[PDB]
Design a protein around this nucleic acid. Structure first.
Ligand SMILES: [Mg+2]
Ligand SMILES: [Mg+2]
Ligand SMILES: [Mg+2]
Ligand SMILES: [Mg+2]
Ligand SMILES: [Mg+2]
Ligand SMILES: [Mg+2]
Ligand SMILES: [Mg+2]
Ligand SMILES: [Mg+2]
Ligand SMILES: [Mg+2]
Ligand SMILES: [Mg+2]
Ligand SMILES: [Mg+2]
Ligand SMILES: [Mg+2]
Ligand SMILES: [Mg+2]
Ligand SMILES: [Mg+2]
Ligand SMILES: [Mg+2]
Ligand SMILES: [Mg+2]
Ligand SMILES: [Mg+2]
Ligand SMILES: [Mg+2]
Ligand SMILES: [Mg+2]
Ligand SMILES: [Mg+2]
Ligand SMILES: [Mg+2]
Ligand SMILES: [Mg+2]
Ligand SMILES: [Mg+2]
Ligand SMILES: [Mg+2]
Ligand SMILES: [Mg+2]
Ligand SMILES: [Mg+2]
Ligand SMILES: [Mg+2]
Ligand SMILES: [Mg+2]
Ligand SMILES: [Mg+2]
Ligand SMILES: [Mg+2]
Ligand SMILES: [Mg+2]
Ligand SMILES: [Mg+2]
Ligand SMILES: [Mg+2]
Ligand SMILES: [Mg+2]
Ligand SMILES: [Mg+2]
Ligand SMILES: [Mg+2]
Ligand SMILES: [Mg+2]
Ligand SMILES: [Mg+2]
Ligand SMILES: [Mg+2]
Ligand SMILES: [Mg+2]
Ligand SMILES: [Mg+2]
Ligand SMILES: [Mg+2]
Ligand SMILES: [Mg+2]
Ligand SMILES: [Mg+2]
Ligand SMILES: [Mg+2]
Ligand SMILES: [Mg+2]
Ligand SMILES: [Mg+2]
Ligand SMILES: [Mg+2]
Ligand SMILES: [Mg+2]
Ligand SMILES: [Mg+2]
Ligand SMILES: [Mg+2]
Ligand SMILES: [Mg+2]
Ligand SMILES: [Mg+2]
Ligand SMILES: [Mg+2]
Ligand SMILES: [Mg+2]
Ligand SMILES: [Mg+2]
Ligand SMILES: [Mg+2]
Ligand SMILES: [Mg+2]
Ligand SMILES: [Mg+2]
Ligand SMILES: [Mg+2]
Ligand SMILES: [Mg+2]
Ligand SMILES: [Mg+2]
Ligand SMILES: [Mg+2]
Ligand SMILES: [Mg+2]
Ligand SMILES: [Mg+2]
Ligand SMILES: [Mg+2]
Ligand SMILES: [Mg+2]
Ligand SMILES: [Mg+2]
Ligand SMILES: [Mg+2]
Ligand SMILES: [Mg+2]
Ligand SMILES: [Mg+2]
Ligand SMILES: [Mg+2]
Ligand SMILES: [Mg+2]
Ligand SMILES: [Mg+2]
Ligand SMILES: [Mg+2]
Ligand SMILES: [Mg+2]
Ligand SMILES: [Mg+2]
Ligand SMILES: [Mg+2]
Ligand SMILES: [Mg+2]
Ligand SMILES: [Mg+2]
Ligand SMILES: [Mg+2]
Ligand SMILES: [Mg+2]
Ligand SMILES: [Mg+2]
Ligand SMILES: [Mg+2]
Ligand SMILES: [Mg+2]
Ligand SMILES: [Mg+2]
Ligand SMILES: [Mg+2]
Ligand SMILES: [Mg+2]
Ligand SMILES: [Mg+2]
Ligand SMILES: [Mg+2]
Ligand SMILES: [Mg+2]
Ligand SMILES: [Mg+2]
Ligand SMILES: [Mg+2]
Ligand SMILES: [Mg+2]
Ligand SMILES: [Mg+2]
Ligand SMILES: [Mg+2]
Ligand SMILES: [Mg+2]
Ligand SMILES: [Mg+2]
Ligand SMILES: [Mg+2]
Ligand SMILES: [Mg+2]
Ligand SMILES: [Mg+2]
Ligand SMILES: [Mg+2]
Ligand SMILES: [Mg+2]
Ligand SMILES: [Mg+2]
Ligand SMILES: [Mg+2]
Ligand SMILES: [Mg+2]
Ligand SMILES: [Mg+2]
Ligand SMILES: [Mg+2]
Ligand SMILES: [Mg+2]
Ligand SMILES: [Mg+2]
Ligand SMILES: [Mg+2]
Ligand SMILES: [Mg+2]
Ligand SMILES: [Mg+2]
Ligand SMILES: [Mg+2]
Ligand SMILES: [Mg+2]
Ligand SMILES: [Mg+2]
Ligand SMILES: [Mg+2]
Ligand SMILES: [Mg+2]
Ligand SMILES: [Mg+2]
Ligand SMILES: [Mg+2]
Ligand SMILES: [Mg+2]
Ligand SMILES: [Mg+2]
Ligand SMILES: [Mg+2]
Ligand SMILES: [Mg+2]
Ligand SMILES: [Mg+2]
Ligand SMILES: [Mg+2]
Ligand SMILES: [Mg+2]
Ligand SMILES: [Mg+2]
Ligand SMILES: [Mg+2]
Ligand SMILES: [Mg+2]
Ligand SMILES: [Mg+2]
Ligand SMILES: [Mg+2]
Ligand SMILES: [Mg+2]
Ligand SMILES: [Mg+2]
Ligand SMILES: [Mg+2]
Ligand SMILES: [Mg+2]
Ligand SMILES: [Mg+2]
Ligand SMILES: [Mg+2]
Ligand SMILES: [Mg+2]
Ligand SMILES: [Mg+2]
Ligand SMILES: [Mg+2]
Ligand SMILES: [Mg+2]
Ligand SMILES: [Mg+2]
Ligand SMILES: [Mg+2]
Ligand SMILES: [Mg+2]
Ligand SMILES: [Mg+2]
Ligand SMILES: [Mg+2]
Ligand SMILES: [Mg+2]
Ligand SMILES: [Mg+2]
Ligand SMILES: [Mg+2]
Ligand SMILES: [Mg+2]
Ligand SMILES: [Mg+2]
Ligand SMILES: [Mg+2]
Ligand SMILES: [Mg+2]
Ligand SMILES: [Mg+2]
Ligand SMILES: [Mg+2]
Ligand SMILES: [Mg+2]
Ligand SMILES: [Mg+2]
Ligand SMILES: [Mg+2]
Ligand SMILES: [Mg+2]
Ligand SMILES: [Mg+2]
Ligand SMILES: [Mg+2]
Ligand SMILES: [Mg+2]
Ligand SMILES: [Mg+2]
Ligand SMILES: [Mg+2]
Ligand SMILES: [Mg+2]
Ligand SMILES: [Mg+2]
Ligand SMILES: [Mg+2]
Ligand SMILES: [Mg+2]
Ligand SMILES: [Mg+2]
Ligand SMILES: [Mg+2]
Ligand SMILES: [Mg+2]
Ligand SMILES: [Mg+2]
Ligand SMILES: [Mg+2]
Ligand SMILES: [Mg+2]
Ligand SMILES: [Zn+2]
Lengths: 14, 118, 59, 131, 204, 122
RNA sequence: CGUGAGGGAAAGGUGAAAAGAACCCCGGGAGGGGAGUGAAAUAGAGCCUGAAACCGUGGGCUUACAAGCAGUCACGGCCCC
RNA sequence: GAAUGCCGGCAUGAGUAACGAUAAAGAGGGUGAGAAUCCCUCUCGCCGUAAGCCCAAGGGUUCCUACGCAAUGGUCGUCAG
RNA sequence: CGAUGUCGGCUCGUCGCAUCCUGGGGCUGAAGAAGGUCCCAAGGGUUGGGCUGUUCGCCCAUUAAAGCGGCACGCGAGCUGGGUUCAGAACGUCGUGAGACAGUUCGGUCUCUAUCCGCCACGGGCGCAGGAGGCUUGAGGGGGGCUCUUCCUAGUACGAGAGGACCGGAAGGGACGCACCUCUGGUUUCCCAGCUGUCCCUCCAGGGGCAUAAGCUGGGUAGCCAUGUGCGGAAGGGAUAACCGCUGAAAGCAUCUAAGCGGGAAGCCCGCCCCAAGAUGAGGCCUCCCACGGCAGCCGGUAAGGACCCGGGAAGACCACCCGGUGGAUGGGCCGGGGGUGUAAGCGCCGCGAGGCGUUGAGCCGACCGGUCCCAAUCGUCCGAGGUCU
């Protein structure tokens, strides 16, 4: 494989 | 729930089912025997029975009624002149469905034949 | 949804146990009265074409 | 057994047989036995039969009338013992069986659509010529 | 404490004292006694009634021996009535008079696999305002790590109907003994053609 | 079948023409009012120089409804609108006459003042 | 693979010798069973050796009232030597 | 024996999701070892400022015919780019 | 910190009791009615709105009451995403500035597939020492449990008056629950009619496709339904809570207690409805088969029975369940009835004509109630006891 789909952002634990 | 409901859907919408029965009727009356799936056979039985009974009546109205489904004057003419007269004394049960032994290779469907009786 | 995933690999014991209910059942067969061939009940005989005692369709 | 027959048999002791036939569109007067503490009197109710739904003994018919400015509809069981009598007031010619549409009509427009049913008026008047 | 078997015929209404009366019509009689249950032999008391006669060409050998041991014709169904011991050998609708109050058991109509809303009248979800594929869903089923499980008996979807139901304190409106008919005011479980039990009421 | 937010025509000379039901005075949490039920409503529309004016929070009895009312004799009556008659805390009509027919149910509910004043009890 | 500059694999071995399996059988073929070759054919070309995970067939013991980091110690039953 | 290690192989999830527009099919006849799926006919439906026809770019034999069905075709295949 | 998603809402609840209501009490500065305060009680119940993202709170209209809390401030592999909590932009304020702010303002991507436990349902297997077809006992579970108004008692007891009961007895409600479809009211994908456009069959007339996965419009049976109908909460028995006692010492009196007995709650036990013998502690009763042939075991043919296969079903996802299989009405057709639509076509007459009238409540016509072997459930196959021991 060559291409990585970006991972989802996290839930903002702010 | 389906409680006390008559009539198969045959995974067709309302107008497709109708033409199925209509095209199956023209086929059966054109040839006298056809092979279909068992469910389609079991339902064509009453669709074709009624047309044949209207042909026993034999009036203009009946011909016009019958023509709504068969649309073919020559075939309707055969139904009224050759098919109906051999059922005059038969009170319904003009068709029959017999089940076949072998299934289709490509989808496993059970087949059966539908014919006009003697 | 949040994409449910298996938590452990299924053992050979658990996998096959789930297939406890997977055997084909053999087909129902009866001898045909006219030609004595074996065929499913309630079907026109595919070997001789007889059903209910009469030749129904040529084979 | 015959479940349909048994139902009829249970209903037969209550089935009425003395009322005039009428149709949606006919004007009609129902004399209805009504109670008011602690006596009972006869209150007429005149209007157009806008609907009749048939279920054997369980047929019921709806009559519509305006009344001191407000439209009032009433539903009667056709075999109710509370009905003293029914008088046929006017035979009306409808093209359909349920006349809900006259709820939104002016008086003059209802008259245009429900013109007098000549044929059944003559039927009435040609009856009542009897011994 | 009396009881009779029967069959739901269908509903209609009558007129009684210038009042409409919704009634179910039950064809109840006539039920032969086919076995009596004695405290000596069985430890309790009840009567095994039979109902609807049967073509013997369908009644098997061990069952024929049962009917014959009581000298009754083969019947289609057998049901007991607890603490009922009729003096005769045949129970009929003549055991119920108008004005009495009965309890009717029947097998309810079968909804099959029913949703949480049809079964338990759950509120469902919104149909707008961003609701996402949950309009008929049941919401939350639990808590979090405490208790970290779902209760036994938490209402969820599943089968619904085709089960034993009894309606209490039903008025008897009329009895027509010549046709074995029993007119009960109200509604009875199950479809027309279903088996029903009609017992005296346990209410006061 | 009257509930909060339902508008009723006003069947008397109180001066109010339209009221909007704001509570059904039939217990703790009744959902609907029918003929004979008292409601609390707001006057949304009234004629000039009335005994009542727009804004007043009044009590009313419902005298006729668009959902047909059923009756023990198996009959049923159904009007063209939802109408009400304005009353005082002692349930007497706050006007001096009533317009239109009214439901006979009002009689055995003790609204005999309205029943008499009405031109037709149906 | 990348527009391009550029990036950049995998893939060796029958047997001494093709003697590389005529011919027959089932089969549409593929594949197999015989026949034949060879010291050897689970050396038959998807070929030296042929481990492990993994999948199957057969057999011995065993299991449907039972609480489990799966073993360990004990005793008893059954099968083998 | 572990480096979310590197290469390879093989499991699990599982006979599960899916098989890519809800424009739609049915029958008879033929071919063939084999046919829902190929050919032929009748019926039915869909597009018709297109889902028809003609250029340009880009692609590069895909065109026609004969013989083929291991793989490619999301199933089948006697058909096919 | 190689991730434990954060407010409020919605949905679904469940528990606690320091009890908001309802039930039971003692004391009262308790006349009555109504309160106050404390005790017992967690069975059930605890409304609809305006404002704000709000929790909170205020307010409207009611109520028996409009209770406080735990469950990761319950619950985002259940939803929401208004607020918080990224990147844009603006205002006030701070900073020379870049920028900043528990200061404000407008906007701003929330992940189809459940492996294990758990939960709702439904089967398959084996077991329940002989094998079978029935009908049952109920160990143990589950469900339910709310409450108001008016009247009578009686304008009595009480009170100067206003006001106004206990106990006992009737009637009518709200919400909730289970079932039902007779009525009311929905739907009813082709059950009937009307209508436009277009293409077609066959020129007229009659019709068919398409305009949605019904072209549109007016209706609409069975089924499934609530807005509709029936019915439920109990009664009753028992044991108690706080509390009130009888007899009664220790302790010549007194004491509900130390011996002993009674009264006493919407609560506890039973009662009602439902599941229920895998209740392996595998229960009981009724009926049927039966000592089979060959070497507590094995292999054969059977018995009573069972399954397969088939026509079906208000039963159902598959499975299961239930009915039927020619000695038969199971489905399909036909016939009668119901029911819907609302007067077919053709012909005759009238009008120049669109039309109208008549034949005619005609024609068509799903499912409902029945009849009728006209068609199809043909013909068959396979399993299945020989009963261990004291
Ligand atoms: Mg990723
Ligand atoms: Mg559906
Ligand atoms: Mg049916
Ligand atoms: Mg499909
Ligand atoms: Mg269409
Ligand atoms: Mg028909
Ligand atoms: Mg057959
Ligand atoms: Mg078959
Ligand atoms: Mg094929
Ligand atoms: Mg989700
Ligand atoms: Mg999610
Ligand atoms: Mg999503
Ligand atoms: Mg899911
Ligand atoms: Mg997923
Ligand atoms: Mg697993
Ligand atoms: Mg494995
Ligand atoms: Mg294995
Ligand atoms: Mg293993
Ligand atoms: Mg498993
Ligand atoms: Mg599986
Ligand atoms: Mg298996
Ligand atoms: Mg029963
Ligand atoms: Mg429900
Ligand atoms: Mg619901
Ligand atoms: Mg909703
Ligand atoms: Mg969204
Ligand atoms: Mg979702
Ligand atoms: Mg949606
Ligand atoms: Mg749901
Ligand atoms: Mg959470
Ligand atoms: Mg836990
Ligand atoms: Mg069931
Ligand atoms: Mg104003
Ligand atoms: Mg104002
Ligand atoms: Mg008025
Ligand atoms: Mg490239
Ligand atoms: Mg290139
Ligand atoms: Mg390089
Ligand atoms: Mg070499
Ligand atoms: Mg070499
Ligand atoms: Mg060598
Ligand atoms: Mg050959
Ligand atoms: Mg070969
Ligand atoms: Mg071979
Ligand atoms: Mg070979
Ligand atoms: Mg050697
Ligand atoms: Mg070797
Ligand atoms: Mg070797
Ligand atoms: Mg070598
Ligand atoms: Mg090798
Ligand atoms: Mg190898
Ligand atoms: Mg093995
Ligand atoms: Mg145990
Ligand atoms: Mg064991
Ligand atoms: Mg352990
Ligand atoms: Mg030891
Ligand atoms: Mg190490
Ligand atoms: Mg490693
Ligand atoms: Mg990991
Ligand atoms: Mg790897
Ligand atoms: Mg795999
Ligand atoms: Mg599967
Ligand atoms: Mg899965
Ligand atoms: Mg699946
Ligand atoms: Mg998928
Ligand atoms: Mg699938
Ligand atoms: Mg796809
Ligand atoms: Mg795909
Ligand atoms: Mg597709
Ligand atoms: Mg279309
Ligand atoms: Mg056809
Ligand atoms: Mg073909
Ligand atoms: Mg093909
Ligand atoms: Mg093929
Ligand atoms: Mg296709
Ligand atoms: Mg072709
Ligand atoms: Mg055009
Ligand atoms: Mg266009
Ligand atoms: Mg290319
Ligand atoms: Mg070719
Ligand atoms: Mg190929
Ligand atoms: Mg091939
Ligand atoms: Mg090749
Ligand atoms: Mg392929
Ligand atoms: Mg593909
Ligand atoms: Mg292929
Ligand atoms: Mg192929
Ligand atoms: Mg070929
Ligand atoms: Mg080509
Ligand atoms: Mg952290
Ligand atoms: Mg990780
Ligand atoms: Mg982790
Ligand atoms: Mg993580
Ligand atoms: Mg995680
Ligand atoms: Mg809570
Ligand atoms: Mg306390
Ligand atoms: Mg209290
Ligand atoms: Mg008190
Ligand atoms: Mg007190
Ligand atoms: Mg006082
Ligand atoms: Mg007091
Ligand atoms: Mg409580
Ligand atoms: Mg609580
Ligand atoms: Mg509130
Ligand atoms: Mg507003
Ligand atoms: Mg607020
Ligand atoms: Mg605030
Ligand atoms: Mg109070
Ligand atoms: Mg939280
Ligand atoms: Mg909370
Ligand atoms: Mg949360
Ligand atoms: Mg989310
Ligand atoms: Mg949230
Ligand atoms: Mg969560
Ligand atoms: Mg999560
Ligand atoms: Mg936001
Ligand atoms: Mg938003
Ligand atoms: Mg960022
Ligand atoms: Mg500034
Ligand atoms: Mg500055
Ligand atoms: Mg800021
Ligand atoms: Mg602050
Ligand atoms: Mg601002
Ligand atoms: Mg915007
Ligand atoms: Mg914002
Ligand atoms: Mg989007
Ligand atoms: Mg994902
Ligand atoms: Mg799972
Ligand atoms: Mg687990
Ligand atoms: Mg089981
Ligand atoms: Mg037993
Ligand atoms: Mg118990
Ligand atoms: Mg247990
Ligand atoms: Mg008094
Ligand atoms: Mg005095
Ligand atoms: Mg009292
Ligand atoms: Mg209905
Ligand atoms: Mg009905
Ligand atoms: Mg209706
Ligand atoms: Mg209706
Ligand atoms: Mg209907
Ligand atoms: Mg039709
Ligand atoms: Mg024309
Ligand atoms: Mg047309
Ligand atoms: Mg066309
Ligand atoms: Mg078109
Ligand atoms: Mg159409
Ligand atoms: Mg309608
Ligand atoms: Mg319609
Ligand atoms: Mg009630
Ligand atoms: Mg004392
Ligand atoms: Mg004393
Ligand atoms: Mg004592
Ligand atoms: Mg006591
Ligand atoms: Mg006591
Ligand atoms: Mg109570
Ligand atoms: Mg039971
Ligand atoms: Mg049992
Ligand atoms: Mg136990
Ligand atoms: Mg047992
Ligand atoms: Mg079925
Ligand atoms: Mg059977
Ligand atoms: Mg048979
Ligand atoms: Mg039949
Ligand atoms: Mg029939
Ligand atoms: Mg008929
Ligand atoms: Mg009729
Ligand atoms: Mg009729
Ligand atoms: Mg006419
Ligand atoms: Mg005509
Ligand atoms: Mg004409
Ligand atoms: Mg002329
Ligand atoms: Mg008719
Ligand atoms: Mg007969
Ligand atoms: Mg045979
Ligand atoms: Zn044969």
């Amino acid at each position: 494989p060559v291409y990585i789909p970006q991972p989802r952002p996290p839930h903002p634990r702010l | 729930m389906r409680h006390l409901k008559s009539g198969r859907k045959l995974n067709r919408h309302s107008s497709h089912r109708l033409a199925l029965y209509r095209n199956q009727a023209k086929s059966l009356l054109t040839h006298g025997r056809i092979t279909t799936t068992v469910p389609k056979a079991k339902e064509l039985r009453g669709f074709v029975d009624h047309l044949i009974h209207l042909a026993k009546r034999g009036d203009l109205h009946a011909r016009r009624l019958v023509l709504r489904d068969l649309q073919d004057v020559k075939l309707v003419r055969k139904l009224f002149d050759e098919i109906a007269p051999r059922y005059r004394d038969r009170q319904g049960g003009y068709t029959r469905v017999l089940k076949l032994a072998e299934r289709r290779r490509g989808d496993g469907a059970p087949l059966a034949l539908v014919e006009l009786v003697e | 949804a949040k994409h449910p995933v298996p938590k452990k690999k299924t053992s050979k014991a658990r996998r096959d146990a789930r297939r406890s209910h997977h055997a084909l059942t053999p087909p129902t067969l009866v001898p045909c009265p006219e030609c004595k061939a074996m065929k499913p009940p309630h079907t026109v005989c595919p070997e001789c074409g007889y059903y209910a005692g009469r030749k129904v369709l040529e084979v | 057994m015959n479940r349909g027959a048994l139902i009829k048999l249970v209903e037969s002791r209550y089935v009425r047989t003395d009322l005039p036939e009428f149709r949606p569109g006919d004007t009609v007067r129902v004399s209805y036995k009504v109670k008011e503490g602690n006596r009972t009197r006869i209150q007429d109710f005149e209007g157009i039969v806008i609907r009749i739904r048939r279920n054997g003994f369980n047929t019921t018919f709806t009559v519509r009338k305006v009344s001191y400015g407000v439209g009032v509809e009433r539903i009667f069981p056709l075999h109710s013992p509370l009905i003293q009598k029914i008088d046929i007031v006017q035979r009306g010619r409808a093209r359909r069986a349920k006349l809900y549409f006259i709820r939104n009509l002016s008086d003059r427009e209802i008259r245009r659509k429900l013109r007098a049913d000549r044929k059944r008026i003559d039927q009435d008047r040609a009856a009542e010529r009897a011994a | 404490m009396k009881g009779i078997l029967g069959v739901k015929v269908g509903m209609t209404r009558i007129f009684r004292d210038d009042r409409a009366v919704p009634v179910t019509v039950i064809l109840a009689g006539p039920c032969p006694v086919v076995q009596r249950r004695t405290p000596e032999k069985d430890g309790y008391t009840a009567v095994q009634l039979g109902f609807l006669p049967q073509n013997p060409k369908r009644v098997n050998r061990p069952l024929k021996g049962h009917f014959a041991k009581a000298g009754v014709e083969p019947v289609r169904i057998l049901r007991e009535i607890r603490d009922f011991n009729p003096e005769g050998d045949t129970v009929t609708v003549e055991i119920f008079k108008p004005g009495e109050r009965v309890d009717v058991t029947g097998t309810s109509k079968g909804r099959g696999f029913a949703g949480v809303m049809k079964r338990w009248n759950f509120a469902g979800g919104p149909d707008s305002h961003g609701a996402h594929k949950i309009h008929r869903h049941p919401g939350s089923i639990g808590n979090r790590k405490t208790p970290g499980r779902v209760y036994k008996g938490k209402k969820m979807a599943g089968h619904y109907g085709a089960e034993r139901v009894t309606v209490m304190n039903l008025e008897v409106v009329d009895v027509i003994p010549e046709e074995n008919l029993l007119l009960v005011k109200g509604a009875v479980p199950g479809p027309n053609g279903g088996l029903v039990i009609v017992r005296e009421t346990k209410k006061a | 079948m009257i509930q909060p937010q339902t508008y009723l025509e006003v069947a008397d000379n109180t001066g109010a023409r339209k009221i909007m039901c704001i509570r059904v005075l039939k217990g703790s949490n009744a959902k609907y009012a029918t003929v004979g039920d008292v409601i609390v409503a707001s006057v949304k529309e009234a004629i000039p120089r009335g005994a009542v004016k727009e804004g007043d929070v009044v009590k009313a009895v419902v005298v006729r409804t668009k959902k047909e009312i059923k009756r023990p004799d198996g009959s049923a009556i159904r009007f063209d609108d939802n109408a009400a008659v304005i009353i005082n805390n002692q349930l007497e009509p706050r006007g001096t006459r009533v317009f239109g027919p009214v439901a006979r149910e009002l009689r055995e509910k003790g609204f005999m003042k309205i029943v008499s004043l009405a031109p037709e009890v149906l």
